[PDB]
Amino acid sequence: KDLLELDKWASLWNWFDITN
């Protein structure tokens, strides 16, 4: 589960919280 514990995959998840 890299997409949740890595740095660069945070700005991506920040866009899921503003588009849900």
């Epitope: 589960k1 890299d2 949740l4 514990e5 890595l6 740095d7 945070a10 700005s11």
Partner: antibody, heavy 121, light 107 residues
């Protein structure tokens, strides 16, 4: 109030096996990961690896694999760290921490008290 | 393996003056994380996500940087800050630390 109860100091023989503990209190380990860090005395920190308490997602530093074995007990809420073939370079102090990934801002929020290990004959 | 070469490793500073310490990487990373460890104690987390303080960190501390340029600065230094401030990244595996800068007081 969150705490991580580790084990006590150890003294092993050059080449024997030894296991450390880290009893996490105040939270469920299944809601996060668990990381171990080795710190050589008077030196810096060295990341060992991690384990997902719920299922198999265990990672280690490729230079640390084979020597380290991180297990976990879901019902006991305690993370364990097993070592093998203890040498003089392995003589160090070992810590215990957690990381909630993206939801916990990655940073190691709560650390254990630290466990000192020594190897000699 | 992205490693962190931290500097200035050894330094001295009295109270009141500003203190800035960097932690550059061998490859571009997106965030830097700071940890303070006092002697005979577990490292307490300081700054996360480049420039976000922890619960007990005084507001005089602050981080900044981008890419491999990453540092930690103090507005005005106080007395209970003399310790090692290890850095860490979370952008690539294996996760690496810096060797930490030892902070001393200028007597």
């Amino acid at each position: 109030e969150v705490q991580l109860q580790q084990s006590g100091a150890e003294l092993v023989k050059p080449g024997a096996s030894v296991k450390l503990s880290c009893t996490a209190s105040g939270f469920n380990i299944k809601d996060t990961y668990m990381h171990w860090v080795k710190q050589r005395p008077e030196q810096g920190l060295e990341w060992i690896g991690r384990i997902d308490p719920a299922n198999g997602n265990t990672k280690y530093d490729p230079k640390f694999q084979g020597k380290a074995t991180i297990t976990a007990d879901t019902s006991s809420n305690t993370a364990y760290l097993q070592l093998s073939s203890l040498t003089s370079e392995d003589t160090a102090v070992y810590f215990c921490t957690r990381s909630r990934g993206y939801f916990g801002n990655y940073y190691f929020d709560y650390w254990g008290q630290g466990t000192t290990l020594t190897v000699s004959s | 393996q992205i490693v962190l070469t931290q500097s200035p490793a050894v330094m001295s500073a009295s109270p009141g003056e500003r203190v800035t310490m960097t932690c550059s990487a061998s490859s571009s990373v997106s965030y830097m994380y700071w940890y303070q460890q006092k002697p005979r104690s577990s490292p307490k987390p300081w700054i996360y996500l480049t420039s976000n303080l922890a619960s007990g960190v005084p507001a005089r501390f602050s981080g900044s940087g981008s890419g491999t340029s990453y540092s930690l600065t103090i507005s005005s230094m106080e007395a209970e800050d003399a310790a090692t401030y290890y850095c860490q990244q979370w952008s690539s595996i294996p996760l690496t630390f810096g060797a930490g800068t030892k902070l001393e007081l200028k007597r």
